[PDB]
C-alpha cells in the first residue's frame with residue numbers, strides 16, 4: 001500500500017487525487033494481443049447476428065426503434081465548436097478532428113448500457129426459449145411478443161444491484177420481455193430512476209443502509225436460486241460482447257461518412273470506465289474493426305481510478321481504490337466503481353494505450369461547455385472521455401513511444417465516447433449545468 005507506492009510511484013499521485021495520465025508501455029500488435037482476450041471475432045459476429053434476429057422483435061416491442069428496423073445504435077457527430085472551446089479553456093491544441101459518439105442517446109435506455117445490458121437480457125431470453133423447444137434460430141422473433149411468451153418469460157426472474165444505467169437498461173428490457181425483474185437500489189438514489197423502473201413494472205427494492213451488503217446478500221440468495229439470474233457486471237463476458245458490437249457499427253458509420261482510419265489517419269478513442277466492461281468491450285470491437293490503427297484510452301474519476309490502479313500495478317481486481325485510501329466518492333456516479341472487472345484488465349491491457357483520471361469539476365466544466373457549444377446535454381460520467389484528446393496531444397513521450405509523425409497527428413480523429421445523458425430529466429440536468437464554471 002505504501003509497499004505499493006514504493007514499487008509504483010504513480011500511486012502517490014492517485015492517493016493525492018491529482019489528475020493523472022498513464023501511457024501503457026506494454027501495448028502489442030493486434031495479433032500478439034488477441035490470444036489473451038479469450039474471445040474472438042466469431043464471438044463478436046455471433047452477437048451481431050443475435051441482435052439481428054431480435055431486430056423484428058425490438059421494432060415492435062419498443063416502437064421507438066421501428067424507424068431503425070429494431071436496431072439500437074447512436075449518432076456519430078462532429079464537435080469542432082467544442083474542440084475550439086477546449087483548446088481555449090485548457091490552452092492545449094487538439095490535432096485533427098474531434099467527434100462524439102452519442103451512446104448517451106441510444107434508444108430505449110439512453111446510455112451505453114443499451115448495448116451490453118440489453119444484449120445480456122436478450123441472450124438470456126433466447127437461450128431459455130431455444131432450450132424449451134419454443135423457438136428456433138430461423139423463427140421471426142416477433143413471436144416473442146405473444147401473451148404465451150410473456151407467460152413463459154414470467155417463469156424466470158432477473159435481478160440487478162444498480163442505482164444507475166445498468167439497472168435502468170436491464171430493468172426496462174427485462175420487463176418488456178416479460179421476466180420478473182428486481183432492481184436493488186440505495187434509498188439515496190434519485191427518485192426519477194425509481195419512478196421510471198416502476199412505470200415499466202420493475203420491482204425496485206430500496207435499502208436505507210448497508211446497500212453494498214444488501215446487494216451481496218441478494219447475489220448469494222440468487223446463487224442457489226435456480227430461476228433467478230442476478231446480473232454480474234464484474235464477470236459477464238456476455239455484457240462485454242454486447243458492448244463490442246459498437247466496433248463494427250462505428251466502422252460502418254466511418255465508411256458512410258467518408259472518414260478514413262489507417263496508419264496515416266489514426267483513430268484515438270476516449271472511453272469512460274466504471275468496472276471496465278463497457279469501455280473494454282467497445283475497445284475490443286474497435287480493435288477487431290480497425291486493428292493497430294485505433295488507439296483506446298480509458299478515463300476515470302480521480303476518486304475512482306480502479307482500472308488504472310489495477311492495470312498499472314498488475315493486481316487488477318485484487319486491489320481496490322479503498323485499499324489505498326481513496327474514497328470512491330464522485331459525481332460521476334456511473335464510474336463510482338472501486339474495484340476493476342474480474343477479467344477485462346487482463347483481457348485487454350495489451351490492446352489499451354493509456355488510462356487517465358479527471359476531477360469532478362473538470363467533468364462539470366466540460367459538461368457545461370458542451371451544452372453551450374454543441375447543444376448536447378450529458379451526465380457527468382459521460383464527459384470523462386472529453387479530457388482525453390488534450391492528455392494525448394500534450395504528451396511528446398506518448399507520441400514518441402508510438403512513433404507518430406506530425407502529419408499522422410494532423411490526420412488523427414479523436415472520438416469521445418459519450419455514455420449517458422439522453423434520459424436524464426430536466427431537473428437533474430439543470431443541476432449538472434449549475435455546477436460547472
Ligand SMILES: *Cc1c(COP(=O)(O)O)cnc(C)c1O
Pocket residue numbers: 111112113164165166272273274275276277278279334335337379381382419420
Ligand atoms: C456503464 C457506464 C459507463 C461504463 O461503465 P463500465 O462499468 O465500465 O461498464 C460509463 N458511463 C456511464 C454513464 C455508464 O452508465
Ligand SMILES: [K+]
Pocket residue numbers: 273274275276300304305306307335337
Ligand atoms: K473505473
